[PDB]
């Protein structure tokens, strides 16, 4: 079985996964809408009661399973719990990241495409007024995606967008086919530094932004000034727990798979806590210093609320490109910005797609080459639903992310710590640990963490399901049809996996 070559490379791969577009876009938007600096109170709390505990647990289950040659949850859940159901529950952690890959790698391709379009200067050049500057870029993006101009829910992506998507897929395969060490780890050692450099460079450039409408200091002001009155809202405390979950990448079965390449007695306590810290630093220091400030600097603090309510997607693909077109040498900035995003995704997409590679290797005894190619084949095929069918992307995101993560995490907690036994689990976490987990975290992992995840479940159940189930167009059933079909298909492979083992 493959293994991580260097302790550093492990942390950089793990952090590479956690650091993504969410760091630079989603996190700054969530903070501004939920108390600003006051949002740090429920965010840090969720990081300590839910994020950190679950991080150690997925690392634990991973290494525990990796020692026995199994990187995926259909096998691992069957080692913690020896039930027919546990294999089935485990399919979700094989199903979830495969659904994400079905649309993320594509979104990742956009950044690459925009990065190229900006580097060669093939971008709109306005013209004055905000809607006169944004619209050429709002339309620039829509021509790439192929946003429907009619009542039809049909996307028509440009030939370029499709070709970049193919190139992007190819790039992923290139790294993935070289294995864990000479591929993922080797790239994590290049990507993360390059990522940091670009972030700092952009940060410095943004602080020097001065327009008649405001400055970057106005952006850091609006973002970090604390509105404690919003801490009364449960929704802020829900968004915080959700964000931490989302930022660390919990519930996707990616940490589990990655940590299964960690050797049996190697540290996971300190190593995980490090990678988790790298992610958070990137979010508050780098990410919160580029997007929101620059937006406020150019449009003034007057629109800072309107900008934040415009969503993370608009901020990153319409707003920020439009601002760069108005700055000295801004075409290059667009290139640095999109190339910054590109790597941030590429370091996550190679992680997300490793779970399916691992399964085919571990359970179906496929070579790494075959396991990589077939995984690429599945993702490429399924993506056409995202590329061509409007709002398919959102349906996959909704189900996979939302439910998947919350439900799976709570499943991971119960199986490992309640079913497999808390004491056996706690030892599994602290074993080989450079530092030991604080004795108080035993109670957090056993009660506080699943309580949070459960209240999150209930709130989530009440607010978002009734919405998607009735008010959405009928075409969502196509996406539902397909993502259900995937789960059935993955059930079947798991079935074939166990039938092959009884023979040998
Ligand atoms: C927070 N770090 C990774 C984010 C996570 O990343 C992934 C998580 C799981 C599988 C993935 C497969 C391909 C690409 C990214 C994947 C997601 C991003 C967007 C929706 S879910
Ligand atoms: Na993150
Ligand atoms: Na990444």
Which key phrases capture this entry?
monomer, 504 residues, mainly alpha, two-stranded antiparallel ribbon, 23 helices, binds the ligand CNCC[C@H](Oc1cccc2ccccc12)c1cccs1
What is the strand and helix layout of this fold?
Blueprint: H1 7-18, H2 21-33, H3 40-66, H4 73-80, H5 84-119, H6 130-145, H7 159-176, H8 180-207, E1 210-211, E2 214-215, H9 216-224, H10 234-248, H11 254-258, H12 269-286, H13 291-299, H14 304-308, H15 312-324, H16 330-352, H17 354-362, H18 368-388, H19 392-419, H20 422-430, H21 441-463, H22 465-470, H23 476-503
Antiparallel strand pairs: 1-2
Helix pairs in contact: 1-8, 1-12, 1-16, 2-10, 2-12, 2-15, 3-4, 3-10, 3-12, 3-19, 3-21, 4-5, 5-7, 5-16, 5-18, 5-19, 5-23, 6-15, 7-18, 8-16, 9-13, 13-15, 15-16, 17-18, 19-20, 19-21
This protein binds ligand 29E and sodium ion (2 copies).
């Amino acid at each position: 079985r493959e293994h991580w070559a260097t302790r550093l490379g492990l942390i950089l791969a793990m952090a590479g996964y956690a650091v993504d577009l969410g760091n630079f876009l989603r996190f700054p938007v969530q903070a501004a809408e939920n108390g600003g600096g006051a949002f740090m109170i429920p965010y840090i709390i969720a990081f300590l009661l839910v994020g950190i505990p679950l991080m150690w647990i997925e690392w634990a289950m991973g290494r525990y399973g990796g020692a026995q040659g199994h990187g995926t949850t259909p096998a691992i859940f069957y080692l913690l719990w020896r039930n027919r159901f546990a294999k089935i529950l485990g399919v979700f952690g094989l199903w979830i990241p495969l659904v994400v890959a079905s649309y993320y790698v594509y979104i990742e391709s956009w950044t690459l495409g925009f990065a190229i379009k900006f580097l060669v200067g093939l971008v709109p050049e306005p013209p004055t007024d905000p809607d006169s500057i944004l619209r050429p870029f709002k339309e620039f993006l829509y021509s790439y995606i192929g946003v429907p101009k009619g009542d039809e829910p049909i996307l028509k992506p440009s030939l370029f967008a499709y070709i970049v998507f193919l190139i992007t897929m190819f790039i992923n395969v290139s790294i993935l086919i070289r294995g864990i060490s000479k591929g993922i780890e080797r790239f994590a050692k290049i990507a993360m530094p390059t990522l940091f450099i670009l972030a700092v460079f952009l940060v410095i450039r943004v602080f020097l932004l001065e327009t008649p409408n405001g400055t970057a200091a106005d952006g850091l002001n609006f973002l970090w000034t604390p509105d404690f009155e919003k801490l009364k809202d449960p929704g802020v405390w829900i968004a915080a727990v959700g964000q931490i979950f989302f930022s660390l990448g919990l519930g996707f079965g990616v940490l589990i798979t990655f940590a299964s390449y960690v050797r049996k007695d190697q540290d996971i306590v300190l190593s995980g806590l490090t990678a988790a810290t790298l992610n958070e630093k990137a979010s508050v220091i780098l990410g919160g210093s580029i997007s929101i400030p620059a937006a406020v600097a150019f449009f003034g603090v007057a629109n800072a609320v309107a900008i934040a309510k415009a969503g993370a997607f608009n901020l990153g693909f319409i707003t920020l490109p439009a601002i760069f077109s108005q700055t000295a040498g801004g075409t290059f900035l667009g290139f640095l910005w999109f190339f910054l995003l590109f790597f941030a995704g590429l370091t996550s997409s190679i992680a997300g797609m490793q779970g399916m590679i691992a399964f085919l290797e571990d359970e179906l005894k496929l070579s790494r080459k075959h396991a990589v190619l077939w995984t690429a084949a599945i993702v490429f095929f399924s993506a056409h639903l995202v590329m061509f069918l409007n709002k398919s992307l959102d349906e996959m995101d909704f189900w996979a992310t939302g439910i998947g993560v919350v439900f799976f995490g709570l499943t991971e907690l119960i199986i490992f710590f309640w079913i497999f036994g808390a004491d056996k689990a706690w030892e599994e976490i602290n074993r080989g640990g450079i530092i030991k987990v604080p004795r108080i975290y035993y109670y957090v992992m056993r009660y506080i963490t699943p309580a949070f995840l459960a209240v999150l479940l209930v709130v989530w159940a009440r607010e978002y399901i009734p919405k998607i189930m009735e008010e959405t167009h009928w075409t969502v059933w196509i996406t539902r049809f397909y993502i259900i079909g995937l789960f059935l298909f993955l059930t079947f492979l798991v079935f074939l996996a166990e039938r092959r083992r009884n023979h040998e």
